[PDB]
Amino acid sequence: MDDLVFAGNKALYLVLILSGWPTIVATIIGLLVGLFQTVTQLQEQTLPFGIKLLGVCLCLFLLSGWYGEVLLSYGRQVIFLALA
Amino acid sequence: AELDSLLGQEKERFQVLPGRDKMLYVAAQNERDTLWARQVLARGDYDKNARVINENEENKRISIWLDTYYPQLAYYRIHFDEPRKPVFWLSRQRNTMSKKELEVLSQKLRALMPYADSVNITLMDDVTAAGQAEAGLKQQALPYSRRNHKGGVTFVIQGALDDVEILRARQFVDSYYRTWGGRYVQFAIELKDDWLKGRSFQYGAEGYIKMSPGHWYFPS
Amino acid sequence: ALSEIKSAFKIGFYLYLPFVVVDLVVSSVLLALGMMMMSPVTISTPIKLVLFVALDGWTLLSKGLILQYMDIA
Amino acid sequence: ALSEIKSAFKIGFYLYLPFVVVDLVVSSVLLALGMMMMSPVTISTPIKLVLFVALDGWTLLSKGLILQYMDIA
Amino acid sequence: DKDLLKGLDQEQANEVIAVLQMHNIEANKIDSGKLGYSITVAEPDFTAAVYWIKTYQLPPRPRVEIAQMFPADSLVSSPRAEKARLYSAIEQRLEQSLQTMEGVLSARVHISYDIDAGENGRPPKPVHLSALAVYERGSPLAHQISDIKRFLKNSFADVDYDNISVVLSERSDAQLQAPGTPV
Amino acid sequence: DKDLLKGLDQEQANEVIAVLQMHNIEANKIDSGKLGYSITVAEPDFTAAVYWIKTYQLPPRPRVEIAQMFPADSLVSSPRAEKARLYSAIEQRLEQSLQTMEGVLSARVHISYDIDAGENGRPPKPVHLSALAVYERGSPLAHQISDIKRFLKNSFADVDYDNISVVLSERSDAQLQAPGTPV
Amino acid sequence: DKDLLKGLDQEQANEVIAVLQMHNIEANKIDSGKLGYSITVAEPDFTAAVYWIKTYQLPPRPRVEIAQMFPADSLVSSPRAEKARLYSAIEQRLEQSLQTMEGVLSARVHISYDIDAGENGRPPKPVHLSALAVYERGSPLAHQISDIKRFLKNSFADVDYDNISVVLSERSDAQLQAPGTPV
Amino acid sequence: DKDLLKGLDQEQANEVIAVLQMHNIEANKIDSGKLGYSITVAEPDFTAAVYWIKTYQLPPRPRVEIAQMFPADSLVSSPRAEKARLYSAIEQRLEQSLQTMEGVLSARVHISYDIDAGENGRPPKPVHLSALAVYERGSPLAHQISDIKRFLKNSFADVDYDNISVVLSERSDAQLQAPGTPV
């Protein structure tokens, strides 16, 4: 049992952490860019649409280079537990 | 300001001897003390000439001189327990000299050691030396083989020795070497892996090892 | 027969977990980017494939399943 | 067989990427126009089809597969 | 006075002082607080102090322990890291216990890390141990190796007397008299 | 007076004092509060104090326990970590029980952690135990080893008298007279 | 007066005082409230007090119980943790029960934690129990071990008299007269 | 005076000074703080100092350790990196232990890194070790190689005396007298 209990908790936990940082950082960016309208309209994030569009691909690429390693470790762990 | 006043608080650690060469000689017991003394001179705390000496250094220096003027002399070691009258041990069997020749040797050694008043030459027995070595190895219960040559004896101690054995062997060898030196008797200590652990085998006149079922090894 | 079936379902359970993690994370990131209307299946599927080949899941499964019955040295 | 499957997945992975890109582009354009309440799939599946056929993807694909095993000449 | 070394730790400085005093070099330790300790000697002794500092490769390093390579701040630890931390804690707890035996002054211990592979689908390998220790003067070393081996053998699930290496040594002569000051 | 050490805590300082007093070195402990304790000695004794600090490798380390590698603060932890904490608590509870027997002044215990394997697909190995203890002067050690073995045997599901190692020693002579002050 | 220790707890200070009085050392306890208790002695007794503090390793630890490793105040629990807490409470309830027997001053109990394996896929192992206790002077220890064994045997589903270890000891001589004050 | 080198660190400066003093060149070390140390010599000695700086390739670039290529502090790690760090920590801990043996002034150790293959599927391969060490003058090197081999053999799961290479050397003559100043 305790192996099934462990792997289930570890799953819910990994979801909580891996979904944490992106939405916090996006909240901070969206806040500060909303606030500094209080001084200047700050076009240079959102006006160059081609640059905003590249930004998403850049973000996704970089992020995968930090998370895939984590998922690989988890996968090896669960397969080990399942078969050994 | 005498030199003895400069060596420290512990007086009896060192012994100061005047030499006919008009130089002070400082006798030390070991390397650590030797460097403790050399520092004082190299710093220049003393104004006249002085030199530091020890037993191993003097044995080496004298052997290097003997190599040149007496390249066939058989001997053991020079003891400096009393630095004013060293003792020189020569082989009784392997040497052949007259009394006059021995006296001449004595005088030339005395010229090499300006701090000594005379050198006593004593003849020792090789059979005694070899016997004390073998008796010591038996006393320690070490395994060994003995080989004899015209001018020397070699004891080979090799195998899968245990920690206890290594320690006791090391202590013994260190004790013997200090007495007789390393010229006549040599000890060779070697560690080797155990081929025989866990395998069935025949021993006797016709031994062999079963490396496994179906595989025979015949060492010879 | 019955005990075997049971033990098989058990294995399948563990195999699902990492992909479930992927499927959730990818949706949460798309919502963070506001592209709420896009179906995430179109992006999650290739990630799953990448993960499985980098993990080399076929070799591991084929080996370990045999190891449960054979003894190899 | 277990090595052939893995090779197949390796290949298909790299073919998915451009279509993903096209989906992101379409979605970002609909948002930048604010023409929000339209599902992008209805627009992007015609585009994917026309683009791949206009480049003869199937032909290049067939050659690229056979050239692992034969010389055509 | 000439400056030899600056910004030392307390436990580096005391080791340098010890080594210079052993060779009859009178040295001085100075504290600058946030800047650490400084070591100084007289000019007549400068050359010697330099030669010994080189020969002993002073100042000494920090001491190394395997648990530093696998810090527990992890999202995921593999089997390998956990097993390593475990064994690296046992090694230290064994050394700390040996220093309580009668007459031992310091010791060091080593364990064969099987952990460099997971034993993944492989049968496990037996454990080997090494130990070094320093004794007070007049100790029957030969008779004391037995105690150590006996004690270590039962600290692990499977160990043979054949697989345990032990090396012992005696303390050197005590340095009690102070070095002489240059004239 | 020359400064030997700064920023010690209470249990480090009292050990340094005990060791120096044993060798006839009169030392002084000063408290600076948030800055900790400081140790000072006279110049005639400085050299010796340095040499002994080196020889014993003072100030002492903090004591290591395996439960420190696997903090119970962690939100999720594998069965290996839990099993380790469990064993690392039983060890300490045993040490604390032995210290209540008649005549024991201090003790140490070690247990074979089979968790170095999970024992997956394999039968669990038997337990091995090692213990050290110090007795008051005039104790029949030979007759007291039996009690310890008897007591330890039943603390685990499967232990053989053959697998229990016990090492005993007596307390050294008491240091009651104070050291002499330098002239 | 010289300061030995600061920031003690109540139950640490009283233990230290007891141990020093036993050796004829007059000590004084001072209370600083939030700063805890302080212990002081005269200079003629300083050396001895230091040596005894080292020999007994005062001040004592807190007392370890296995339940502390698996707090009920935690967001998750494996079954292993629950099972551990259960056993850790049974132990303490037995310790608290024995102290009500006639003549027993204090006691300690240990149980075999078979939970260090799940007992999955295998039949469970039998329980083993160990107990230490202290009696008043003039008690028939031999005739009292029977009662303890009888009592313990029925506290578990399957226990054999062979698997129960019991060790008894008598109270030391009473320290009633006060120590002498230094001249 | 002519400038040889600027912006040195403490260890590079002391190394250069040591090498120059050995050849009878009087040198001066100057501290500029944030700018580091500077080394200067007289004109009559400038030529020689240049030739020796070239011949020894001074200043020495700093010591390399394999863990520096796979720095532990990272967002990510992979089995190859973990295994490498592990071996590169065992190497350092062994060298630090050998320097505690009697007479050894410094030593260096090397291990066969099998990690350049994953050892996954492929069966793992036996270990090879090499050591260098320097001894104090008057040491029986022949009798001391045995101890080292014995100690190293048991540090690993599978090592044969045939696979261990050991090379020993003695310390050079001491440089105690100061060089002469140009006329």
Ligand SMILES: CCCCCCCCCCCC[N+](C)(C)[O-]
């Ligand atoms: C709506 C998201 C659902 C995520 C479900 C993830 C699988 C959870 C399986 C249960 C894990 C906890 N456990 C083993 C104690 O039951």
